Amino acid sequence: RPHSALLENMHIEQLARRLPARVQGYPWRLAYSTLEHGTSLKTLYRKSASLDSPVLLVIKDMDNQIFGAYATHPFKFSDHYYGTGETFLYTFSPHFKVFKWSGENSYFINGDISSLELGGGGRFGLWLDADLYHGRSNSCSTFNNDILSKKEDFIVQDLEVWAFD
């Protein structure tokens, strides 16, 4: 079993039970960490470039709340949305909750030069700036999610991207 600087053992177990069958039982491998690597979206893209695997995004904001996404595709720069229906958002605040694909649109993942976002329909379920510093979470139609953080706007304390290959 893995050790995360952000997820306690109980959180890892709750998340692992919600992963799709595609990666059930697969060991977790830490591909990008703001604690270990340069803190920037560019570094995240570069550390994701060799991944042959769906990925698990783990964010801890400056209020110590934990939330993120399971994405069917490694995070990459794009000029249109990508990802498919197994992508979901999750949060642990106030309690562990998963927001699966609603079927309403397929705006799962978009990697801009200056931001990474999941969800669409002008709200993003999850948005991170180019420094992985400012973030935002809104209810969006892709996932019909709750605001993943306390309020809409948050600050990343640290984040991790795990892979299964």
Numbering used by the authors: 54 to 174, 176 to 219
Please quote the authors directly.
Nuclear receptor coactivator 7 (NCOA7) belongs to the TLDc [Tre2/Bub2/Cdc16 (TBC), lysin motif (LysM), domain catalytic] domain-containing family of proteins. NCOA7 and NCOA7-AS both interact with several subunits of the vacuolar proton pump V-ATPase, which leads to increased acidification of the endolysosomal system and consequently impairs infection by viruses that enter their host cells through the endosomal pathway, such as influenza A virus and hepatitis C virus.
Here, we report the crystal structure of the TLDc domain of the human NCOA7-AS protein at high resolution. NCOA7-AS has a tendency to aggregate and to form large oligomers as judged by size-exclusion chromatography (SEC). We therefore alternatively expressed and purified a truncated form of NCOA7-AS corresponding to the TLDc domain, hereafter referred to as TLDcHs, using E. coli as an expression host. Analysis of the crystal packing with the PISA server revealed the potential existence of a stable complex made of three TLDcHs monomers within the asymmetric unit. The overall structure of TLDcHs is globular and consists of two α-helices in the N-terminus and ten β-strands forming two antiparallel β-sheets. The two sheets, organized as a central pseudo-orthogonal β-sandwich, are made by strands β1, β2, β3, β4, β5 and β10 and strands β6, β7, β8 and β9, respectively. The fold is similar to those of the two previously solved TLDc structures from D. rerio OXR2 (TLDcDr) and D. melanogaster TBC1D24 (TLDcDm). TLDcHs shares 62% sequence identity with TLDcDr and the two structures display an r.m.s.d. of 0.7 Å when superposed over 164 Cα atoms.
